[PDB]
Design a protein around this ligand. Structure first.
Ligand SMILES: CCCCCCCCCCCC[N+](C)(C)[O-]
Ligand SMILES: CCCCCCCCCCCC[N+](C)(C)[O-]
Ligand SMILES: CCCCCCCCCCCC[N+](C)(C)[O-]
Ligand SMILES: CCCCCCCCCCCC[N+](C)(C)[O-]
Ligand SMILES: CCCCCCCC
Ligand SMILES: CCCCCCCC
Ligand SMILES: CCCCCCCC
Ligand SMILES: CCCCCCCC
Ligand SMILES: CCCCCCCC
Ligand SMILES: CCCCCCCC
Ligand SMILES: CCCCCCCC
Ligand SMILES: CCCCCCCC
Ligand SMILES: CCCCCCCC
Ligand SMILES: [Cl-]
Ligand SMILES: [Cl-]
Length: 205
């Protein structure tokens, strides 16, 4: 199993975040994770499970679900991820997730609806050498219903860039930059450029 500890700062929202995440995978193909996230402007819990269906030596499909709890209520995210181990050192992934909210919120028409979201994620991971792995995750999400993001649009993006250092077989420090679109909100103003800078470490328990 792996414990991941991460700290970050978001420039638009002027917010620190921390994450503690524990994950395990099994030989039968199951995988599960649980995490807690904190956010402090100058909490949530998520649980995820999936299963690997091996289509051949290089291709895997993982149906799964992400459940998310916060002050507003519960959100469920059933998904299917397709992964391709193109080489020993290069992996690609694509995931569709439907983030469905178990609670209603006021929409832009004044009605109480569900702020459900269609979410797509692309993944590239490249093992550069014994010392370094570089990962990029690109994200698009769009509103199913009559809502908008803080960028004033029905859609938004995230792009995350992670450099992992394989310090020991069981310890992997990493640094990360994310651009989270103009989703920053601070001091009563939205549409702020949201740069995110993170540092963390992943280790074997
Ligand atoms: C790349 C920068 C790493 C940032 C590490 C963030 C650690 C969390 C700090 C918690 C303090 C929150 N605060 C400032 C509101 O008290
Ligand atoms: C091994 C740590 C991984 C996180 C596991 C989650 C355990 C439950 C903690 C819930 C957080 C309680 N809180 C902060 C919302 O008050
Ligand atoms: C649409 C073009 C897709 C980009 C291809 C990425 C390059 C790595 C693929 C090489 C793997 C070939 N093979 C047969 C060993 O699996
Ligand atoms: C989840 C990644 C999606 C990959 C995009 C489509 C490129 C597929 C390449 C086919 C593989 C060719 N082959 C059998 C020689 O490895
Ligand atoms: C003056 C507040 C800036 C805090 C930025 C933190 C960078 C890691
Ligand atoms: C505006 C804050 C910038 C934080 C940079 C962190 C070190 C690259
Ligand atoms: C035999 C491998 C099939 C590749 C999976 C394609 C899924 C659209
Ligand atoms: C034998 C490999 C087939 C590739 C299918 C690609 C699905 C996006
Ligand atoms: C030698 C293979 C490099 C091509 C990788 C392109 C990834 C989209
Ligand atoms: C001051 C502009 C922030 C963009 C930094 C990009 C880091 C890779
Ligand atoms: C792999 C290159 C993606 C760069 C996207 C950055 C958008 C701010
Ligand atoms: C390759 C990371 C740079 C992303 C561009 C966003 C900076 C404003
Ligand atoms: C409380 C967050 C800790 C940040 C981890 C940094 C590891 C180098
Ligand atoms: Cl619905
Ligand atoms: Cl729009």
């Amino acid at each position: 199993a792996t414990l991941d500890v991460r700290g970050g700062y978001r420039s638009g929202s002027h917010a620190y975040e921390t994450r503690l995440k524990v994950s395990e995978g099994w030989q039968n193909g199951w995988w599960a994770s649980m995490e807690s996230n904190t956010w402090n402007t100058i909490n949530d819990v998520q649980v995820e499970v999936n299963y690997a269906i091996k289509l051949d030596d290089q291709w895997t499909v993982r149906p799964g679900m992400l459940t998310h709890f916060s002050s507003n209520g519960t959100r469920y995210g059933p998904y299917v991820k397709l992964s391709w181990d193109a080489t020993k050192d290069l992996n690609f992934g694509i995931r569709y997730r439907y983030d469905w909210k178990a609670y209603r919120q006021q929409d832009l028409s004044g009605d109480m609806s569900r702020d459900n979201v269609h979410r797509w994620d692309g993944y590239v991971t490249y093992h550069i050498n014994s010392d370094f792995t570089f990962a990029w995750q690109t994200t698009l999400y769009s509103k199913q219903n009559d809502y908008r993001y803080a960028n004033h649009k029905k859609w938004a993006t995230e792009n995350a860039f992670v450099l992992q250092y394989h310090m020991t077989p069981d310890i992997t420090p990493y640094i990360e930059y994310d651009y989270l679109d103009r989703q920053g909100v601070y001091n009563g103003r939205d549409n702020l450029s949201e740069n995110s800078y993170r540092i963390g470490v992943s280790f074997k328990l």
